[PDB]
CSV table of C-alpha atoms in Angstrom, one decimal:
chain,number,residue,atom,x,y,z
A,1,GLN,CA,24.0,-2.7,0.8
A,2,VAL,CA,21.2,-0.1,0.5
A,3,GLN,CA,18.3,-1.3,-1.7
A,4,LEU,CA,15.1,0.5,-2.8
A,5,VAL,CA,12.4,-1.2,-4.9
A,6,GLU,CA,9.6,0.8,-6.4
A,7,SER,CA,6.3,-0.7,-7.3
A,8,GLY,CA,2.8,0.3,-8.3
A,9,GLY,CA,3.3,2.0,-11.6
A,10,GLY,CA,1.3,1.4,-14.7
A,11,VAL,CA,-1.2,2.9,-17.1
A,12,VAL,CA,-3.8,5.2,-15.6
A,13,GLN,CA,-6.4,7.4,-17.3
A,14,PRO,CA,-6.3,11.1,-16.6
A,15,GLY,CA,-8.2,12.2,-13.6
A,16,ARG,CA,-7.9,8.9,-11.8
A,17,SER,CA,-5.6,8.1,-8.9
A,18,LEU,CA,-2.6,5.8,-8.3
A,19,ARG,CA,-0.6,4.8,-5.3
A,20,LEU,CA,3.1,4.1,-5.6
A,21,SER,CA,5.1,2.3,-3.0
A,22,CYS,CA,8.9,2.0,-2.3
A,23,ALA,CA,10.2,-0.9,-0.3
A,24,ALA,CA,13.5,-0.3,1.5
A,25,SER,CA,16.1,-2.7,2.9
A,26,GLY,CA,19.7,-2.8,3.8
A,27,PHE,CA,19.5,0.1,6.3
A,28,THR,CA,17.4,1.4,9.1
A,29,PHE,CA,14.5,2.9,7.1
A,30,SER,CA,12.9,4.6,10.0
A,31,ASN,CA,15.9,6.8,10.7
A,32,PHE,CA,16.0,8.6,7.3
A,33,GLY,CA,13.9,11.0,5.4
A,34,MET,CA,12.9,10.2,1.9
A,35,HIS,CA,12.3,11.9,-1.5
A,36,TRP,CA,10.2,11.1,-4.4
A,37,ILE,CA,11.8,12.3,-7.6
A,38,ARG,CA,10.4,11.9,-11.2
A,39,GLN,CA,12.1,12.0,-14.5
A,40,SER,CA,10.5,12.8,-17.8
A,41,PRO,CA,12.0,13.3,-21.3
A,42,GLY,CA,10.4,16.8,-21.5
A,43,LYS,CA,11.4,18.2,-18.1
A,44,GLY,CA,14.4,16.1,-17.1
A,45,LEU,CA,14.8,15.5,-13.4
A,46,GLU,CA,12.2,17.1,-11.2
A,47,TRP,CA,11.9,16.8,-7.4
A,48,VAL,CA,8.4,15.8,-6.3
A,49,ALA,CA,8.1,15.4,-2.5
A,50,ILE,CA,10.1,15.0,0.7
A,51,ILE,CA,9.1,13.4,4.0
A,52,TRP,CA,10.8,13.5,7.4
A,53,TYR,CA,11.9,10.4,9.1
A,54,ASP,CA,8.8,10.5,11.4
A,55,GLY,CA,6.4,12.0,8.9
A,56,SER,CA,6.1,15.2,10.9
A,57,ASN,CA,7.1,17.5,8.1
A,58,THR,CA,6.3,17.1,4.4
A,59,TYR,CA,7.1,19.3,1.4
A,60,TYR,CA,5.9,19.2,-2.2
A,61,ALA,CA,6.8,20.8,-5.4
A,62,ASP,CA,4.5,23.5,-6.6
A,63,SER,CA,3.3,21.7,-9.6
A,64,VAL,CA,2.0,18.8,-7.5
A,65,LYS,CA,1.0,20.6,-4.3
A,66,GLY,CA,-2.6,19.7,-3.3
A,67,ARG,CA,-2.7,16.6,-5.5
A,68,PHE,CA,0.0,14.3,-4.3
A,69,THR,CA,0.3,13.0,-0.8
A,70,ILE,CA,3.5,11.4,0.5
A,71,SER,CA,3.4,9.2,3.5
A,72,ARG,CA,5.4,6.3,5.1
A,73,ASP,CA,4.9,3.2,7.2
A,74,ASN,CA,8.0,2.8,9.4
A,75,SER,CA,6.7,-0.5,10.8
A,76,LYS,CA,6.6,-1.9,7.3
A,77,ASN,CA,9.6,0.0,6.0
A,78,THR,CA,7.5,1.3,3.1
A,79,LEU,CA,7.3,4.7,1.5
A,80,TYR,CA,4.0,5.7,-0.2
A,81,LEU,CA,2.9,8.3,-2.7
A,82,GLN,CA,-0.8,8.7,-3.3
A,83,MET,CA,-1.3,10.6,-6.6
A,84,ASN,CA,-4.7,12.1,-7.2
A,85,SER,CA,-6.1,14.1,-10.2
A,86,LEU,CA,-3.3,13.1,-12.5
A,87,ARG,CA,-2.6,15.2,-15.6
A,88,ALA,CA,-0.9,14.3,-18.8
A,89,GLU,CA,2.3,16.0,-17.8
A,90,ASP,CA,2.7,13.6,-14.8
A,91,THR,CA,3.8,10.8,-17.0
A,92,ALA,CA,7.4,10.0,-15.9
A,93,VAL,CA,9.6,7.5,-14.3
A,94,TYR,CA,9.4,7.9,-10.5
A,95,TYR,CA,12.3,7.2,-8.2
A,96,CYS,CA,12.3,7.0,-4.4
A,97,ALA,CA,15.6,8.3,-2.9
A,98,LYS,CA,17.2,8.2,0.5
A,99,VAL,CA,18.6,11.3,2.2
A,100,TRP,CA,22.2,11.0,3.1
A,101,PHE,CA,23.6,11.3,6.6
A,102,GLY,CA,25.2,14.7,7.4
A,103,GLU,CA,25.8,17.3,10.1
A,104,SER,CA,23.0,18.8,12.2
A,105,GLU,CA,23.1,22.3,10.5
A,106,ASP,CA,23.8,21.2,6.9
A,107,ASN,CA,21.3,21.1,4.1
A,108,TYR,CA,20.4,17.7,2.8
A,109,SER,CA,19.7,15.9,-0.5
A,110,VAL,CA,19.6,12.3,-1.7
A,111,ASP,CA,22.5,9.8,-2.1
A,112,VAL,CA,20.9,6.5,-3.0
A,113,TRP,CA,18.2,6.3,-5.7
A,114,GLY,CA,15.7,3.5,-6.2
A,115,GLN,CA,15.3,1.5,-9.4
A,116,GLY,CA,12.4,3.5,-10.7
A,117,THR,CA,8.8,2.8,-11.9
A,118,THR,CA,7.2,4.1,-15.0
A,119,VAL,CA,3.9,5.9,-14.8
A,120,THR,CA,2.0,6.7,-18.1
A,121,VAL,CA,-1.0,9.1,-17.8
A,122,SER,CA,-2.9,8.7,-21.1
A,123,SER,CA,-6.5,8.2,-22.2
A,124,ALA,CA,-5.5,5.7,-24.8
A,125,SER,CA,-6.9,2.2,-24.6
A,126,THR,CA,-4.8,-0.9,-24.8
A,127,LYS,CA,-4.3,-1.8,-28.5
A,128,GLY,CA,-2.0,-4.2,-30.3
A,129,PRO,CA,0.4,-2.9,-32.9
A,130,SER,CA,0.1,-2.8,-36.7
A,131,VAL,CA,3.2,-4.3,-38.3
A,132,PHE,CA,4.1,-3.0,-41.8
A,133,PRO,CA,7.1,-4.1,-43.9
A,134,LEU,CA,9.9,-1.7,-44.8
A,135,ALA,CA,10.6,-3.3,-48.1
A,136,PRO,CA,14.1,-3.1,-49.6
A,137,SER,CA,14.5,-2.2,-53.3
A,138,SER,CA,16.9,-0.5,-55.7
A,139,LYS,CA,16.2,2.7,-53.8
A,140,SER,CA,17.5,1.2,-50.6
A,141,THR,CA,20.7,-0.4,-52.0
A,142,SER,CA,24.2,1.2,-52.1
A,143,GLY,CA,26.8,-1.2,-53.4
A,144,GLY,CA,26.5,-4.7,-51.9
A,145,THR,CA,24.5,-3.4,-48.9
A,146,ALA,CA,20.7,-3.1,-48.6
A,147,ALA,CA,18.4,-2.1,-45.8
A,148,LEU,CA,15.1,-3.6,-44.8
A,149,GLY,CA,12.9,-3.3,-41.7
A,150,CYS,CA,9.6,-3.4,-39.9
A,151,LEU,CA,7.3,-0.6,-38.8
A,152,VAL,CA,5.5,-1.2,-35.5
A,153,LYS,CA,2.7,1.4,-35.5
A,154,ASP,CA,-0.2,2.4,-33.3
A,155,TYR,CA,0.2,0.4,-30.1
A,156,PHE,CA,-0.4,1.3,-26.5
A,157,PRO,CA,1.1,1.1,-24.1
A,158,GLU,CA,4.8,0.7,-24.0
A,159,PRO,CA,6.8,-1.5,-24.4
A,160,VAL,CA,7.1,-3.8,-27.4
A,161,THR,CA,9.9,-6.2,-28.2
A,162,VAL,CA,11.3,-6.8,-31.8
A,163,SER,CA,13.5,-9.7,-32.8
A,164,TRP,CA,14.8,-10.8,-36.2
A,165,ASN,CA,14.6,-14.5,-37.3
A,166,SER,CA,13.8,-15.5,-33.7
A,167,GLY,CA,17.0,-13.9,-32.6
A,168,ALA,CA,19.2,-15.5,-35.2
A,169,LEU,CA,20.0,-12.2,-36.8
A,170,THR,CA,21.5,-9.6,-34.5
A,171,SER,CA,24.5,-8.1,-36.4
A,172,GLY,CA,23.5,-4.7,-37.8
A,173,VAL,CA,20.1,-4.4,-36.1
A,174,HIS,CA,18.9,-1.0,-35.0
A,175,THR,CA,15.6,-0.8,-33.2
A,176,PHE,CA,14.7,2.8,-32.6
A,177,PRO,CA,13.2,4.1,-29.4
A,178,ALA,CA,9.4,4.5,-29.6
A,179,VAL,CA,7.9,7.9,-30.4
A,180,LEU,CA,4.5,9.2,-29.1
A,181,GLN,CA,2.2,10.3,-31.8
A,182,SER,CA,-0.5,13.0,-31.8
A,183,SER,CA,-3.1,10.2,-31.3
A,184,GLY,CA,-1.5,9.0,-28.1
A,185,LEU,CA,-0.3,5.8,-29.7
A,186,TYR,CA,3.3,4.8,-29.9
A,187,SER,CA,5.3,3.8,-33.1
A,188,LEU,CA,8.8,2.7,-33.8
A,189,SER,CA,11.0,1.2,-36.5
A,190,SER,CA,13.5,-1.6,-36.6
A,191,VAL,CA,16.0,-1.8,-39.5
A,192,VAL,CA,18.8,-4.1,-40.5
A,193,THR,CA,21.5,-4.0,-43.2
A,194,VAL,CA,22.1,-7.2,-45.2
A,195,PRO,CA,24.3,-8.1,-48.2
A,196,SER,CA,22.5,-7.2,-51.4
A,197,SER,CA,23.5,-10.5,-52.9
A,198,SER,CA,21.3,-12.3,-50.3
A,199,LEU,CA,18.0,-10.6,-51.3
A,200,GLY,CA,15.4,-12.9,-52.7
A,201,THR,CA,17.0,-16.1,-51.2
A,202,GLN,CA,17.5,-15.5,-47.5
A,203,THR,CA,14.3,-15.2,-45.5
A,204,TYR,CA,13.9,-12.3,-43.0
A,205,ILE,CA,11.0,-12.3,-40.6
A,206,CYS,CA,10.6,-9.8,-37.8
A,207,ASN,CA,9.0,-11.0,-34.6
A,208,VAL,CA,7.0,-8.4,-32.7
A,209,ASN,CA,5.8,-9.2,-29.2
A,210,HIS,CA,3.5,-7.1,-27.1
A,211,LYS,CA,2.8,-8.6,-23.7
A,212,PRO,CA,0.1,-6.1,-22.5
A,213,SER,CA,-2.1,-7.3,-25.3
A,214,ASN,CA,-0.6,-10.8,-25.7
A,215,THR,CA,0.2,-9.9,-29.3
A,216,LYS,CA,2.7,-12.0,-31.2
A,217,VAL,CA,3.2,-11.2,-34.9
A,218,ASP,CA,5.7,-12.7,-37.3
A,219,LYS,CA,5.9,-10.4,-40.4
A,220,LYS,CA,7.7,-11.5,-43.5
A,221,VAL,CA,9.6,-8.8,-45.4
A,222,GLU,CA,9.7,-9.3,-49.2
A,223,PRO,CA,11.6,-7.1,-51.7
A,224,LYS,CA,10.1,-4.9,-54.4
B,109,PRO,CA,58.4,77.6,-4.2
B,110,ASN,CA,56.2,79.2,-1.5
B,111,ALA,CA,52.7,78.3,-2.7
B,112,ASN,CA,49.7,78.1,-0.4
B,113,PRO,CA,50.1,75.1,1.8
B,114,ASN,CA,46.5,75.0,3.0
B,115,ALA,CA,43.1,74.2,1.4
B,116,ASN,CA,41.4,76.6,-0.9
B,117,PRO,CA,39.0,76.2,1.1
B,118,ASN,CA,36.5,76.9,-1.6
B,119,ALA,CA,37.4,73.7,-3.4
B,120,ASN,CA,35.1,71.0,-4.7
B,121,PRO,CA,33.0,69.6,-1.8
B,122,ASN,CA,31.0,67.1,-3.9
B,123,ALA,CA,31.7,63.7,-5.4
B,124,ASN,CA,34.0,63.3,-8.4
B,125,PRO,CA,31.8,61.4,-9.6
B,126,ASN,CA,34.4,59.7,-11.8
B,127,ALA,CA,36.1,58.5,-8.7
B,128,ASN,CA,36.8,54.8,-8.2
B,129,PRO,CA,33.6,52.8,-8.4
B,130,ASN,CA,35.1,49.4,-7.9
B,131,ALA,CA,35.8,47.5,-4.7
B,132,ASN,CA,39.3,48.2,-3.3
B,133,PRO,CA,41.1,44.8,-3.1
B,134,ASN,CA,43.2,46.1,-0.2
B,135,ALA,CA,40.1,46.7,1.9
B,136,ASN,CA,39.4,45.3,5.4
B,137,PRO,CA,39.1,41.5,5.0
B,138,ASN,CA,38.5,40.9,8.8
B,139,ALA,CA,35.3,40.9,10.8
B,140,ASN,CA,34.4,44.1,12.5
B,141,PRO,CA,34.7,43.2,16.2
B,142,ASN,CA,32.1,45.8,17.2
B,143,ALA,CA,29.5,44.8,14.6
B,144,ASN,CA,25.9,43.9,15.2
B,145,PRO,CA,25.8,41.1,17.9
B,146,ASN,CA,22.0,41.0,18.4
B,147,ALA,CA,19.6,38.7,16.7
B,148,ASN,CA,17.9,40.1,13.7
B,149,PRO,CA,14.2,40.7,14.2
B,150,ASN,CA,13.7,40.6,10.4
B,151,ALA,CA,15.2,37.2,9.7
B,152,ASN,CA,13.9,33.9,8.5
B,153,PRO,CA,11.1,32.8,10.8
B,154,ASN,CA,10.1,29.8,8.7
B,155,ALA,CA,11.6,26.3,8.8
B,156,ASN,CA,14.3,25.5,6.3
B,157,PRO,CA,13.0,22.8,4.0
B,158,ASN,CA,16.5,21.4,3.6
B,159,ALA,CA,17.1,21.0,7.3
B,160,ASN,CA,18.1,17.7,8.7
């Protein structure tokens, strides 16, 4: 069926440029106009640009007019978005989308969305995480259930993976979504509930992995 | 009985103004055949962004 694959996203410092591409297959790409639409947690869904099937007419959102340039290569079946003078608020997931087929006098929007590519505009440098133990004690025990965890602090960029006992412990694990701090570094927590009668005897180790920095940390969590 | 069957005619010539301000539901719901058939000089001269 129809398939759209975005590529080109990554980490870019503010003020620099970045070029996104969208490879289309499963349909005659040269016969359809295309949209670029971005999604951010702060603004939700936000239309960015539209291009005609032949590139004759292009339109842009007001917040990006003059900085972004949408183009296409119908011989390569590729849609392009050149982004210049990036600001912090442009960090979002960018989707390409295909205009649906309709009648000659109708208004048009998109019916098939691409997979999406993440763009993070930040001046933070690549940095491995600091792993701190969330130690269980009497203050984290209610009956026969205790809670312990690992705090993964001050890393950039996203994402990081957390496992417990090399994947052997999955029941009751809650890894929270990362939060962006005032310093531009991300931080998150991962917690697990265990039988209180197992504390002190069963070994629990959290395995944090961060591919952008090739960081692998096995942190042992001991009670207080 | 045998009251005056004509106008005053010095009656009220102004609005009520407490008359009905709503839209009469039993109005004309059809198109006025002799309405404006010309093109509007003050219309949209741009290109619809949502056009095909």
